[PDB]
Design a protein around this nucleic acid. Structure first.
Lengths: 61, 60
DNA sequence: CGCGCG
DNA sequence: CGCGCG
C-alpha cells in the first residue's frame, strides 16, 4: 500500500468497469498483478471490491 | 548448477525429507521463499520431489 | 500465472 | 499457507 492507492484503484474500476489485477496495476504505472493484489484483497475484505472467480476480474460492490 | 542446489541435495541426503523452511534455515537463510526457486528448478529436472501431503522435499 | 501469503 | 511467479 502506497498509500491511498486503493482510492485510485477505486476510480479506475469505477470508470473502466470490471478488470483483472494486471490491467489495474499497469493503469497505475506498475508492472505485475502482485503490485496491487494485497491492496485488492484488503479492499475485498472491507467489502469495497469483489472478484469474479471465473474471469479473475475485480469490480466495485 | 548454482552450487546451492548441490548444498540442498546434501542436506536432504543426510537429514531426509524436509520442508522448505527447514532447508533454508539450514543453509543460513530465513524463509522458504529463499530456496523455493531452486527446489522447483531441481524438481523439473527430476532431482527432487515434494510430498503434497507433508510439503516435504525428498531426493527422487 | 490463479498467488490473496503477513 | 500449497506460492515456484520472472
Amino acid at each position: 500500500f502506497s498509500q491511498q492507492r486503493e482510492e485510485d484503484i477505486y476510480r479506475f474500476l469505477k470508470d473502466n468497469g470490471p478488470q483483472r489485477a494486471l490491467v489495474i496495476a499497469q493503469a497505475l504505472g506498475m508492472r505485475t498483478a502482485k503490485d496491487v493484489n494485497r491492496d485488492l484483497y484488503r479492499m475485498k475484505s472491507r467489502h469495497l471490491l469483489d472478484m469474479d472467480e471465473q474471469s479473475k476480474a475485480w469490480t466495485i460492490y
